[model samples]
Structure formats: structure tokens, C-alpha cells
Target: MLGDQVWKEVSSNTLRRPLIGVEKMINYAEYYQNGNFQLTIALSLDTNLSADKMQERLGLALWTVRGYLPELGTWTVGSSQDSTLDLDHVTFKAIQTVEEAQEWIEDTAILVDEGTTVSEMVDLLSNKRIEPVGKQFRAYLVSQPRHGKPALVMNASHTLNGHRMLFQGSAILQALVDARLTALVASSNSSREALEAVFVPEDISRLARKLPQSLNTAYADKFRPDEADVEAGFAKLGERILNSTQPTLGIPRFSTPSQNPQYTLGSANGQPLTMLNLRRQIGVTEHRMLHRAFKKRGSSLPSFTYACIVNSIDRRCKASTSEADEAPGANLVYSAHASRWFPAETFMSRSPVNMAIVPGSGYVAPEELRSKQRGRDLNESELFALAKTIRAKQEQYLESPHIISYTAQVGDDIAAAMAETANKQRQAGTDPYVALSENSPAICPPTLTSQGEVPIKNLYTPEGASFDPKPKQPEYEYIYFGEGLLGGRTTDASVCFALWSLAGILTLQAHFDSRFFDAQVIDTILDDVVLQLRRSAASAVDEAPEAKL
Candidate 1:
């Protein structure tokens, strides 16, 4: 049977386990219960290098520290052969099974530096601190020949991005674009990039303009500007400039070149392969475990909603890899943070798919005055980055209140079956994805139609109109979708076709026999986020609402 200790170790009990040495290998079981925990850590870190170098050193450092396993086995020593990581930048991750927590105790005080022993460095992982990072985790299953499948890996990472509108001075504008786009709803036929830009109000296009373009203003709708608001915005702008221009201000922006696969391993052979690079594979597996732990029993998420969530996660995983390869100078956290901004931007898009604005953007928190202000001003690099963030957020703010809609009509059976399929795969403990079907008869949870309207005008305007005067596209094209790939039904497929097909890397990755993930999961998550698209549909309404439903 599987070891009983897995649960105990995870719970930090260290007392009982069906398995023998479950607690032996564990140094400390860190649970980032709060979502924002990691963002606090990032914010507290030094921002005094080029954005790229800052990202690189921090990425190397965080991975070095993060992957450290005092009692667990590690896979590879370093990322690559030609890396610039310091010995301090990286360390060997050791793995082993532990029996008890007391094994870590000493004569009087607690033992520190438990490298091979117990542990080291205890930072209080507070709920407030963890909130921004949001709840994210990774899991693994380790089993010997006859032993029950034991939970071998359960780890959480803060996955939320830092503040928005802060990329003005940084060199991650493209990433900023990508982040915002991911949050926007898209047509089945729309390009990923186009889906992102169509969700904003046109008048706010100047959101990206920095000091040279205009004064940094905190004209928020939530946090009413205080006496110090302008000063804070200016100071924040100054910091961005300083951080951006100087090499010493923040991490360097480009540590590695982006790698577009000549052959993506998952879709290479005309069949969906269950394999993913270790990190992503681990993330997919963990997502299943985490969702099971968090989801209510009996009723599962809707298929579309489930698909959206998993897709969001997949996007994140892809973004993480992209950041790692593209901005080695940046930390993994930074890369992940920047990458996640796509969702934030997606939420902020004119055709927002999901996500909502934080309440305090226009309203400053009362607790702000309590923070101990310091004069350790940002370096040139840091300032530049600050500028970029301001610009992106500003742009996002201007584009709020758009919508997206389904071109095809759907029904309940499809939704429930999708949910069932997802639940089955979750029970099986595998990655989940919605398979593409041209002929498959499963339908949607509800009837959907073309969003016969445009979401945004031009990127540079406040309240503009869509380029499509007719609004919706042709039936086959889903004109409401703006621009996208053409898709159709098919069961028998080849690897050559799968990789090059309209499904994109995501659809190709889902073609597994064992069903690593459920399509329902993606659908369910998407359902939850579908509200972002309400505006695009709402845009069709000529008169304002009477305020009552």
C-alpha cells in the first residue's frame, strides 16, 4: 500500500505515516496558504540591477533556494552547461525520507542549516504576505515496485504578478502585451494577440505614456488621490526611470534567447504525448492534486470553466518557460510575475475574459501611511521597469469593460460529460486538457452566439470603435472573434498535422491516451471567467441599463 506518511508530512505532523521514513527527507513543509505570499517576497528583494540581470540573478538564486531539498532527490544540478550562476546562485538538491520532526531538534535551541540534517532560515510565511501570490502548487507521486502510490511531492509557489502599470521603464513591453492579452476573451478564430488588445476603452490609450510623454498620474477610481498621491506617482516614475536606465538598478531583462521549438516534444509524432519538460509536467500534475484538495465534492467545475483554468495554468507554464529562456537575467519569480501579467491584461482587455480590477487602485489603502518610507531610491534599471508597469496598468485601466461570446450553441450534456471526464482524470491523477473535435458531438453548457460588436477602438484612443464595421464575422469565421486560426472537426490525425494544426501547442499537448487532464476542467475555468466577455455582448445594447436586472 502507499505510505501513510505523505499526508502527515504534508500536514507537518511528522508523527504518523503509513510509509516508513516519510518525514526523514523533509526539512520543513512550507504551505503558502495565502495567494500573494510570494509577491511580498519579490517586492522585498533588492531591485538594483538591470531588469534582465535582476531577473537572471534572482531566477538563479530563487531556483537554487527553491529547488533545494535537504532530504529529497534532485534531477539536474544546474539549468544548462553555459550558465552564469554562482556556486551560491545554485546548490545541489538532495532527497531522502525522514521518520520524525524531532530528528531536527538539538540540545537546546532548534537546529539550523539542516542541509543534510534538519533545516535553515525560518521566515514567517504569513497569510497577508502570501495573499498576492495566490494559491499555486506542484505535486508528484513516488512509488516503489509494490508500495501503494505515495504522495512524493507537494509544493506551492506564489504565482501572482507584482503591481500593474509598472512596466513603463522596464524592457518587457512585449511581455506586458502578452500578459494583458491572455486575460482578454478570444473568438475560436482569433489570434491570441488580437484577443488581448480588443477589450479596452479607447480614450485610455495614453496609459502607456511615461514622464516624457506626460506626467505620471494616479487618477484612480478606487483610491481617491491623497496629498501624497501625485508625489508617490512621480516618485514611482522616478524609480522606474532609474531602474530602467542603469545596469545596476534591477535585473537584466534578457538572460536567454526565446526558444521556438523546431519540434515541440508533446506534439512531435502525430500523437499527443504525455511528456512535458520537468517543471511544467510537475505543475500540471500538481494542479490536479491541488484542485482536488480545494474543490467541493459531488459537483465539479463546468467543462468550459475547467478548460479556462487549466488553460490559464498552461499559459502560465508556457510563459514561465518562455521567461526562463528569454529573460535569464530575471528571476523565476520576476519572469513568472511578468508572464502572469498577461492574465491581468487579459482581465483588463476590452474583451476581458475573466478577472476584475482590485478595489484600491483609485483608492489608497489607509494602511499605506503605516509603511516605513525609505530613501534607498531605485537605480536606473529599477526606474525604467517602474515606468513600464505604470504604462501597462494605465493602458489596462483604459480598456476595461469589453466582452467575448461563443459562436456555437451548446447544451448541458456536454457540460456535465466534460465535467465527468475531468473528474475521472483528476481521480486518475494526471494532467488534463480538452481534446479538439471537428466531429465529436459534445456541446457547450449554454447556447452561445457571435458577439455582434467590436470591443475596442484604437490602442491610442479612449472610447474608440472596432476595426470591423460589421462587428461579427462570417459564421465559419466567427467575425466577432476579430482574427484567429480556422478550426474544424477531425479524429484521425497525424503528428505533422497536429503540430501544424489550428489547435496550437495547447490542443496538441492534450492528445494523451491515459487522459492526463480533463477538457471539462478547462471549460469550467473558462466559464467562471466568461464574465469578462459580457461587455462585448453588452456593447450590442444601444441604451444604458435602468440599473435593475
Candidate 2:
């Protein structure tokens, strides 16, 4: 309504169905003119299949998966003035036949050159904005194949994804790859060996039948906070914000640094993130030894790795234990927890695995426990002790209710923050990246995600002889994924730890902001982490010859 010009009346009512608060919060990101906080995840495949056939396979595969997860291109993210989002049911024109699929391939896949490197592919997608009002996604098929196979990148808006949906990306990729492999293997009507059967078809059918039919409502019913919960959570967040000294992990910026007083959290002044990646692989021997040590020491890979990360970082790069302790109820790290809160019914079915997640963190352990010794410099005992301490912190974080209530307000708080930023952007905007310029101090803790061993192993294996195909189709060589514009939500020097193991080998990819920390800086950090893991794994193997892999 214009000033003083009111309609006779305005009316509204609450939705009959449940609504997720996080979705409401992220809906505001639709206005991030640069691109609405899209996540670009790619899988590297090992096959010589021409890009032509690969596109056909993937495009058809999208149509194939549409029957199961119809939400793909069939729904639009309708955003409201109040910042709520509707997973509005609608249909993009049908894309069933090879002709339609080909058209989709041409429209959806961004143009890339044969010489495009993985980083270049990520950049192309990160800068490519998807209209949330329509389908909130785009796909790219580029030739990374050499003696290797082609790579596929799925770029999606964060507004449409829930935290719990870890494998949604992988699931989509798996289904597409399966379509192609089946196409190849089916040429001869060949069926591969049946070494073992991991699941009973009958059992799965029974399990799926028990799944709640409405995944969205069921998810909202379980996780949505009560009015009282939201009130208390809001107060808690306000109290912490006022009392705590915002922790700024002293990560040196690639640029000079921001001096503007207006520079703040979640500020979107329109700069694309410049992420540089450093990759490392752990061999079967090293991976096996680490697993063996984990079991013997009553520690898991996530716990041990978290410990290694804390030790490997220079104190200057992160908030120290003393810093986190300097304020009551302060935290330094951010990790996301999924499946931990899912109801048994939800877990039984694959319906809502792509739901929203809870941003979680743990209070730092005392230095006496984790140690000042970082990298290869730490003694074996200190490393084990660090693992034990971190394991406790990890367990405590999972069990704690601190962050749970806080997330109830996350959607609302973020919505308000972004709305403010949106208004600001309407006035002015500049810079593609703060490259060669200064940036705000790094408060964004390098995100660490461990999808332990990547359960979606089919993406790694082409056969289904039970688990292997008759005529083996190409399998995934590796997987790399992370959100774009990540640091824009916090600091410029943000780094994301994308860690997982495939076929008994561990893969660690560190994507650091190229506009902030350079390759050498990240390289040194990665080297320290790897050395820390190696030394720690070795000590466990030596001390516990009693250990079994």
C-alpha cells in the first residue's frame, strides 16, 4: 500500500500444512543478485564416452529420476514478501524423449571449453545465477576426461535445499550414471556377478511402505519449533551476540582488508567468491591403518580428523581455546549434523534425506588435552590424547541442545539480515571479488564436512553384480562439492574441507578463497593436516599391533 492509501481490508491465514523456518529464512537469498547462494558439486567420472552421449545419458537420466523425486524441475521456489517460501507445485514442459532430453541438455548445460579445468568449471557455475521463481538449478557437462572421464556439475540454489539432504546431490548423480550404465550393459542384456546382496528387496519394500507419505510436512512436524521455543531461542541469540566478542579467526586475506564500518556479516555487496582448491588422497594402506586405529582407540574418523585439524592450524588462523573461553558460551568451529535428528520413519525411507541441516559446533577442548604441538611436530601420545578430547567434544555437540533451539531462530534472523542487505544493494553495488583489495577479517571458520566413506558407493563403482555390473560401465573417479559465495556469509578467507573416502581410499579437498588466502598458504595447512594424520595413524599402528583392519 502507498503511504496513507490503505485497501478496505487485508486478510491472511496460517498455512494448513507445516512450514520449515529455515526455508523462510533462506527465501530472502533469492535477491542475492550475484547469484542466490548456489552450491556447485561435481563428480569426476572415468570413461571415454563422448560428451555427446554423456549429455544424452544425463539428460535422459534427469527425466528418469523425475518419476521418483519429481521435485527436480517440476517445482518452483515461490518467495513471499514476508520471507516465507512455498515449494510450489508446477511442471516445467515435459522432457521425456531423447529429443526433449537433448533440448534440455543444450539449455541446462553451461558452455565450457575442452581445456576448462575443474576450478574454471566451478567459477562458471558460481557466477551463473538461477531464477528462483522458476527452477532453482542448472547443470553442466564438461570434458575433464583424458585417460579420465568427463565431469558433471550440479549447481543449485541454497534456498531450495534443506540441511538434512546430504545425498540429494549424490543421489541425483548416481541415478543419472546408473541410467547410462544400464544403457550400456543392457545392449547385451547382460547381468553381472552376484558376489553378495547388500539389501533384501522385500525388506526395502516393507521399510519404504512405513515411510510417512508427505515428506515435507512430516519433516516440518518433527523439526518446526514452537512459538515459545522461538521466543527463547531469539533471546538466547541476542544475549550471546551482545555479550560475546565476535570471534574473528585471524585468517590473512588475499586482499588488503576491509576498513568500512558498514562491512558486516552476510553482507552481499556483489562479489563472487574466488575459491582455490588443494587435493590429497590417502592410499588403501593408510586408510586401512587409520580405520584400524579408530576402532582400537574407540575413536572415529570424524573425531580424529577434527582433532588433527585443530592441531594443524596455526593459532593465528583460528580462534584459540583461550579465545573461545574468553566469552561465556562462545564457539569457534561450525559443522553440520544430519540424520542425527531424523525420526526412525524418515530414516527408513529416502523421502526427505535432502532436508535442511542443523549448523553445529563444539566448545574447544582445553589446550592441555589437545596440545600446542601441531602438524608432524606433535608426539604420538599427544595426538591420541587430542583425538580422545575431540571425540568427547564431538559427542557432546551431538547430544547438546544448545544449537538446536538456536536454529529455530536462524531462519528468521537470517531473513532479517538479508532483507536489510537487499535494501542496501538496491542503492549500490561493486566488485566481482575483493581481489587485490582488502577484505573484512576472517570470522568464517573453515567448514569441515565428513560424509564418512561416502555411502553412495555406486557413484564410485559401475557394476551391480549385486554391486558390480555385467559389462562394467565407467565408475566415478572422484567427487568434489561445496557451496559458492561461502565466505560472503562470513569472512573472506573462508575455507571448506570437503572430505570423504572412496573404495577404501581417503580424499581430502581444501577449497580456500583465492581472493584471500593463496595456494601456498592453503598448501601449507593441507600438508600439516596430512602429516598430522599420517603421524597419528602410524603411532596407533605401532602401539597397537593388536589392532585389526
Candidate 3:
């Protein structure tokens, strides 16, 4: 059993689990007035139903949660049917009966009628639950179709470590949709009983048997240190702050690389500008082609991409700055991981399995193991090895508890350090150190696709409804999703593969100051990004066996 005081000793009771390193960064981001950290997945369903019919389908989808009970343990739902629409605050489990489910759904709809916005409805759903774990995952179902067609817009609320809950929530919802679709086709009309029949209790039992009873909470115990440990972590972070190097400003900046006088309101603009580009060369088939080409040499798309990014940025850095120092280069790489802490006896569920790593000299190993390949140009094997090493470090960071406490404290410590640096610069009669104060240009999120194949665009529309000529795109004026990886608040670039896109291209989006970064610079960074993927592919073919295995 987990210790009762385990979470109390760490920090942030509002979160489901103790705030991991990445989450702490998010909270600090809030301190800086940029803290809306959320991920949403809009799934277009093949089967379009009227508002009433869709609500009924949703009711059936929710009822399937009963099958997940035995695996839930203390988190399970009550056995008896509930008449009251009062939802259980402790657990966001399925409602007890079909009638209660309808009542709750109707009540939720009523709130919208009374003037509650859809976004607010989602917020209420997120905060309704009290359990630490359950609070991290929340969902909402719309009664109407989006864009004249019927499609479910699923929104996930997350504080940190999105890999587990965000991905799991999408997967579970997709599974529910698949089950619902199957029932509708087989019976042509899914009675409440018929819908429930699709998901047998035995199916859940068998699946639960394969899960663990609990996660290894023992890893976190190391962070349960005395007051000195707290001080030590902060001090180490301060050192990291003072020793900060020039970051890779990925976009083309119109302004020179210097502190702007208009630093009172952070950047000149409220936030950064965004550029969205789709790389055609590294499409789905190309990803597979690269995967196969590099298989013999032991490399993957992610690994090669990292190498290209590091190499590209290094090239840019040399052109702009003359900060020639003897110190080795360090790249702050953050990646998402889905941690399954519970055993098979417990049901499969999402947990906080995330990590943030500053990949340095000793960190990116196996490649580091190849000492000769170290200082010189990195070979194809070395690049692949380096990527694998970074992945290994990410996994290690998740399992290691001490790293969590140390990492969480870094955000606040660094923030404090930046303030001190700003003050010192002011005292020395210099302009504000913009680089130190604002979001780091280095932070990037990975490219993740939604679970399963995306339905055709036509499937998104109803029989009588005409398809929308252009779908609405997200607006990003000053603050754009800048990174490819999730978790970090200081993200400047984020990439996501539109599973719905038939062309199989990946959209690389970045948020940067328009004054500093011009269109050419943005184009160059994107060009380099695609160039890196292709380089990895070509190198793989050059090194791999001529004959297909």
C-alpha cells in the first residue's frame, strides 16, 4: 500500500499526483501570466446521429465504466442505481444506472441553457473530482454536431505529464466509439440493453487481470527529505541558471540578438507569433521508409530528428554568436512517457509517467560510449545511439523520485535566479536580460498522433449537411505552441501529425516574436527540420544492407 503522507510531503495538493518536474514548470509559468496548459483532440466520427441520439450513445459509452470497477478498488462506483443527479465528488466513474446517466447528462445540458459556456462545462468536469489521480483526467461531450456535421469534440484537462492521461483518454473514448458503432450496425437500433451487452464484464475482468495492483511509489520516497534537501535542490538550480548559455532561437528574428528597451511588458508583444508548415517529404510512408532504412543501423525517426535539430541549431549559433567557450553543449530535451504503475491484477489506467532531461556530455550515452566518435562529426550510428541514450535518460528520470523533487524545484529556483540576474543587470546599468526572463527558445514538444486511423472528412458530415469548405484553425497572436514535446510551459515549437490528414504530412508550428523572427528565419528552421529527417533517411540507406531483409 502507498503511504498516506507520501503526497503531503512533496507539493501541490491540487494536482492528482505530486507535481512532477514538468508540472512545477507549468505552475511557475502561471506565475509569469502564461499558464493555460491544456491538450484537446477533436475526433470526427463516421456515424452521425442527431443531438438526442448522440446523447443516448454517450450514455451507453459512460455505462461501460461499470466494467472497470473491480480494477478501480477504492476508486470504484457504488453497486446500486442512483436516482439523484448528484455525481460522486471522489470518483469520476460511470453513473450507476442508465436513468441516472440521462439525468446527469440532462443536468449538464441544462447548465449550458442557463448560460454556462462549453469551456466552463469542461472546467467544472475537471474540478468535480476529488481524487488526485481522477482529477488529472476530465472529459465533456457536446450534444450538437460541430460545423453542420456530427463530431465529438473531446477535451482533456491536464496539469502535467500528458502522455499517460491524454493518450489514454483518447484511446478509451475511441474504443467506446468503436463499441457504440458496432452495436448500432448489428441491431440497427441499440437498445440500452443491447449497447451495454457490447461491453461484457468478463472483457474488463480479463484485461484487469493483466494490470498491477499499484505503481512503484517507493521511487518517490527519496524526495521525502529534510529541509536541507530542499535548499540543496534550489541552490543547484541557481547554478544552472547563472551558467545558462545562448538558446536556439529557431525562427528568423527581424531584430538583432540584443535586449530590447521595451522589456517592461516582457516581450514587445503580449506573446509570440506562430508559423505552421507541413513537411511533405517526411510523410507517413517516409517515416516508415526511414524506419526501415535505419533498422539495420539501429535508429528511429525521433532520434534522427533530434540529431538534425541539434546540428542545425549549432550551425546557426556559430553564425550569430562569438561566445566561444570551452564548455560542452547541453540541450534541454523533454519527452512524454505513459507510466503504468499498477499491476495486472489492477485495471489498466493512466498515471504520471513523465520526464524532462537536459541532455549533456555524460547523458546521451551508447554514442558517448563510442569515445572516438565524440568530438568529431557524429556518424549515423552515433546519432542513432545518441537518440536512444536521450530516450533512456527520459525513462530513468520518470522512475527516479529524487529527480522529481529536484526538477520541480528548478522552475521556481530558476525564476528566482532570473529575477536576481535582472536586478544585477539593472544595478550594472544595462538593459534587461530578455533571454533570461522570458520562455526558453529551446523547449519543444514531440509529434504525437491520435490513436487509430482518422475517419474520412466526408464521414464528419451528416447525410443532409454540406461539408465546410475550410475548418477553423486555432488563433495564436503572441503566445503560440512553440515546441514539439508536451509538459514544458516555455515551449516555442510544437509539432503534431494530423491523423485526419489524408496527405500524411506533419504540421510544425512555432511561436516567436515577429519583430525578432522574420518569415525567412521561420522558413529556414522548418527547412532544416525537414532536411534533418531526410538526412537521417539517406544516411540509413547509405549504411544499411543493399538487399531487403
Best by lDDT: 2
Best by TM-score: 2
lDDT of all the models against the reference? 0.21, 0.48, 0.36
Can you give the TM-score per candidate against the true fold? Answer: 0.17, 0.67, 0.51
What does candidate 1's lDDT look like per residue over 376-443, in tens digits? Answer: 22322222233234334333432321100010011122333444554565677642222222212221
Where does model 1 exceed 4 Å of error?
Answer: 1-161, 164-517, 524-540, 544-549
Q: Model 2: which ten-residue window has the lowest total lDDT?
A: 1-10
Report the lDDT tens digits of candidate 3 across residue range 1-549: 242332221112110123334444443332232222434333333343345554544544444432442222212112224453211111222234455545443332221222333433333332222223222323345444233323333333233223333233333344344544435644745445554445432332133222222122333442355566555544544433543333321222333333332221122135322222223333555655765765556655555565555445444433222133432343333333222332322223422222222211113322242336354256556667666765564444444223333554454455456456545756776532243224433332222222222222221221212223332441211111111211112222232222222223333333322223343544465577576666766766766646134
Model 2 earns a TM-score of 0.67
lDDT of 2 at 11: 18
Q: Could you give me the TM-score of model 3 versus the true structure?
A: 0.51
lDDT score for residue 108 of model 2: 53
